[PDB]
Design a protein around this ligand. Structure first.
Ligand SMILES: *C(=O)CC[C@H](NC(=O)CCCCCCCCCCCCCCC)C(=O)O
Length: 39
């Protein structure tokens, strides 16, 4: 009861992770990394 937008309150956590993972991949190298992207 209370709270709302449950899928968003999970999405922010998956986005912090996926975004930090994607920023890691770009920071680390991006297409130049060679590692496929976190996807
Ligand atoms: C949010 O989406 C977190 C998970 C996400 N992974 C993926 O998107 C890939 C698919 C993961 C499927 C996991 C299914 C687990 C089923 C239950 C297993 C119970 C037994 C386990 C025994 C060891 C991510 O980004 O990490």
């Amino acid at each position: 009861h209370x709270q709302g937008t449950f899928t968003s309150d999970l999405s922010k956590q998956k986005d912090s992770r996926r975004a930090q993972d994607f920023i890691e991949w770009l920071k680390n190298g991006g297409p130049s990394s060679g590692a496929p992207p976190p996807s």
